[PDB]
């Protein structure tokens, strides 16, 4: 369908330590309703609607220099939540599992007074956001 | 709506030379049906459906080292096309405007015999894919 045209089909990201990354994403994408698509020795993909998220193991010869979200390339990914309650729930989960929570001083309005969201970090230091409608 | 839950809300990417990048994305996102959302001195965002794409100027002190899609972080973004014809059309456009076309030796099946797509590079060397249904 031409209706799908322009929608994002998939997004592929190289990760430093696959195992650790898969632990985080399985959890988050799990909490957000994604299902596993394909898993292999060097990666894993997840499905939601008509868009996939694919994570691959960074090759040895390319693990250095390490990823920095301030540099050219990816800064962050943001996802929709059904409600503020969901954002609150995720925030609490994050704290428990120890995933880094950003801008705690302004949470859940670090993005502005009319922007209700949690900002965190995946194991690669990639910034991740979940925003309430 | 809880129906939106888990969908990607937006994706933010730092770019090396904003002007050049905006030239490419305006064109591509233009060809894919996106509309401009917000433009400022250091960036620009585009809208399609319920998801936005945001491009920001990489800070001076962070332009080095340059982006490499093989390293940890973003490798590529892929988008849906309505048809093979659209993919062919985009390929021809790419060649004309001189944007780099990848895996020309296998095009439009560089991704496999049952994967019809064009792979190219944005001005940052970020890999970009448009895939036929
Ligand atoms: Zn954001
Ligand atoms: Zn792809």
Automatic annotation (TrEMBL), chains A, B:
Q: Which UniProt keywords apply?
A: Metal-binding, Zinc
Record-listed Zn(2+) binding positions? 10, 76, 129
Q: Which residues form the VOC domain?
A: 7-133
In terms of SUPFAM superfamilies, this protein maps to: Glyoxalase/Bleomycin resistance protein/Dihydroxybiphenyl dioxygenase
- Gene3D superfamilies, alphabetically? 2,3-Dihydroxybiphenyl 1,2-Dioxygenase, domain 1
CDD domains given for it?
VOC_BsYqjT (cd07242)
Record GO terms (molecular function): metal ion binding
Q: What is this protein called?
A: BH2160 protein
Q: Which PROSITE patterns match?
A: VOC
């Amino acid at each position: 369908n031409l209706y799908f045209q322009g929608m994002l089909h998939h997004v592929e990201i190289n990760v430093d330590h696959l195992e650790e990354s898969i632990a985080f994403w399985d959890w988050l994408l799990g909490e957000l309703g994604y299902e596993d698509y394909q898993s292999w020795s060097r990666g894993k993909s997840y499905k939601h609607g008509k868009t996939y998220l694919v994570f691959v193991q960074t090759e040895d010869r390319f693990q250095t220099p390490t990823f920095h979200r301030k540099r050219t390339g990816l800064n962050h990914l943001a996802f929709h939540a059904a409600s503020r309650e969901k954002v609150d729930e995720l925030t609490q989960k994050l704290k428990e599992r120890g995933d880094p929570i950003l801008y705690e001083d302004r949470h859940p309005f670090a993005g502005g007074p009319n922007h209700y969201a949690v900002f965190c970090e995946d194991p690669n230091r990639i910034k991740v956001e979940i925003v309430a409608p």
